[model samples]
Target: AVDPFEMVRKMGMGTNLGNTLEAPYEGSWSKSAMEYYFDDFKAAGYKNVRIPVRWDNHTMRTYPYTIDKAFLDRVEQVVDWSLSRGFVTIINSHHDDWIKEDYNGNIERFEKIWEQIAERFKNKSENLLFEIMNEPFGNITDEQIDDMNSRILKIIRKTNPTRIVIIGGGYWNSYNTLVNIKIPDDPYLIGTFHYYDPYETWGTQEDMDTVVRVFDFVKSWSDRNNIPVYFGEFAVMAYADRTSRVKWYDFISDAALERGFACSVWDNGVFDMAIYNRDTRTFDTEILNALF
Candidate 1:
């Protein structure tokens, strides 16, 4: 098994394939993924690519809860694209609201979906990672999140024992919740959290203080628990004064790296918060420069 810390180190910087696969359909919210995006990611010096997928809508609502074969194939193609480019790829169950809306009713369905996914990617390289769920808010509790993480980890272990699995806290993977997550006694685990920092109240000096304070707390928790952390998502809308946005990206990333945490910025490929411009096949230089 690869050392979790070493794996985190390799995943130095990443960007989420947000708003693409996580939409109701591939191209519904944003353009569907194209092969060249992976090439661009590698060329841009990004070491990782986190693909957020919405499996619930692409799945049957029957007993098996099987993910659509076509959808799975499309996802694999994207995954292969990233892996082929030597990027540490992370995929997670994003926007699966059914389970969160009714945990008890959909727990089995959720398990079956993960079972299928685990079996399908069992032979993939260790650079491929599985994030149990994304955000994990709505009708779920912290205890339920822990239970779900444990359940899915077991399901994944059955096929890929050494595959690194990312588990985040409840309430949108907030730092407050991350500190309380009950990590299982498994070596192949990475704790993750998101940091949007409430766009409305951002920019104030207090917000800056809060960002550093949150990083400090998460870093302390990681050290005490001996688990590597991943800052799974953080972004500033493009409308937010470019100068401030650049500073946010620079400061937040530096804070995460300084604390020995792997981090990935959120990029929807095309939109207000997007970092990459799909039409021109280029990235926002200011944002890109800050991240690198």
Candidate 2:
């Protein structure tokens, strides 16, 4: 069995493969995922990659909600690229608004999707982690969130009893939400939270202090629960000054490291928050320096 604590520490510097598979379609928002991106990440010394996938768009709305085989094959291909590069990889149901908006109506479809995912990846490497959902924020109640998570965990357990699974609280997986949400009692589970506290003026001393304060709160919660934490996503918006943006990355990266949390920065290919420049096949040096 994998040790969740050691696995998280090993994840170290992580980055998201965003706007690729998770887009409405491959290349709909950004370029489709290319194998070279994983090669570049490995060379850049990143140890983890979160591959957000929009399974909803590729599945039928009818009973069983069958995910398209071709879509699954493409996802597996990308996942293989990451795993082969020796990265601790994550693949989750991203941009699935239907379930979040109406949990009761979509309960059957949601469960079936995970059932297929769990069964498909059951025999894969332990480094390939499964996150139940990206963020549960729409009309989903606390009790419903717990129920949904518990049911999914049970489904995954049928095929993957020891696989290290990731789960987060409702309300966009913020630190405050995670601490209050009920966590399932599974040994192979890790808690996840996203931090993107926006600001009109970026990288002020006060903002840096707030980063420290929030991380401290998360750290205290982690210790109380004995659950390892993954800072799944965080980024400063593009409108911020370059220096200020770099400072935000620098401060938050250090804070996460100081408290033994592993994180992946959000990089939606062409967005202001992006760290990787797809055209140049490189990361912005300022952000790269701040993170690593």
Candidate 3:
């Protein structure tokens, strides 16, 4: 299979939907709606789509649990939609409210979830990737994250040996975690992190402070490791200064391209940091085109 990093560069423009698009539960649209989202991305020259799903929202209380078939079918529909468009699809176990149970020093649950995840996507094409967990919470110890990661990788490899899997650092995917976490020997795996730098400048004051720290940490680690990184999420609310936001995007985009890292904007709709219009389902192309 081709390298995910290489694929990411070849395909630019990616984003995630917060609570609306494909949440495991309490979402407004059906999975078919993702096709419309993917179409917009494809039209914008994006070739990769990362779908963040919360499995716990659909599963019952079993350890080695089976996700709801209905939910899996919904996810599969979206995956097929992207694939049908000749786009690479990344299916991740994201925003799982149970991440703490799996990643925060709970080795048993961690291994159990991966077992089910692997079984579900093992037959997917090489273009379809798996991110083990998104923003494994802050309380998870670095040692626990490492152990969970190692064990999950081992189990996943047993079934889908070469499929690319994304691993994020702990503390809400902090830069420090990215730098310090163990990278497995498998070439198919890639390091993942989120970038919402100088959050004060971009997001609300509190988010800004936290993200500023994250930005500095990630930049330092990227410089040290020289490995490909992916900004899984980054965006500012529309209330921010338009010019400043554009400048931020330009700076980060250029930096990522120069460093051979991949990035995805935080969302597609106009609400919650989305720069595009939800009604029209179109990007604020004028703003983005001007910057890009």
Candidate 3 regions exceeding 4 Å error are 21-32, 101-110, 169-178, 195-200, 203-226, 236-239
Q: Write the per-residue lDDT of candidate 1 for residues 1-292, one digit (tens) a residue.
A: 7988999999999988889999988899988899999889888889999999989788999887888899889999999999999999999999888898889899999999999999999999999999998876446777788799889999999999999999873222223433655779899989887743232224445556777778788887788888898988876334346677778888888888989989889897664688888879988888888987
Model 1 clash tally, residue pairs: 0
Model 1 residue runs over 4 Å out of place are 169-178, 196-201, 236-240
lDDT of each: 0.83, 0.82, 0.64
- Which candidate do you rate higher for lDDT, 2 or 3? 2
Write down the worst ten-residue block by lDDT for model 3.
Answer: 169-178
Q: Estimated TM-score per prediction?
A: 0.94, 0.94, 0.80
Q: For model 1, what is the error of residue 111's alpha carbon versus the real structure, in angstroms, after optimal superposition?
A: 0.2
Which digits, one per residue and each the tens of the lDDT, describe model 2 over residues 1-292?
Answer: 8789989988998899888888888899988999999998888878999999988889989997999989989999999999999999999989888897778999899999999999888889999999998875445777887888899999999999998888883222123333554678889888887642222155778666666777777788788888888978877344357778887888888888989998898888884568787789978877888998
Decide which is better by TM-score, 1 or 3: 1
Error of 3 at 173 (Å): 11
Clashes per candidate (backbone, < 3 Å): 0, 0, 2
Output the better candidate (1/3) by lDDT. Answer: 1
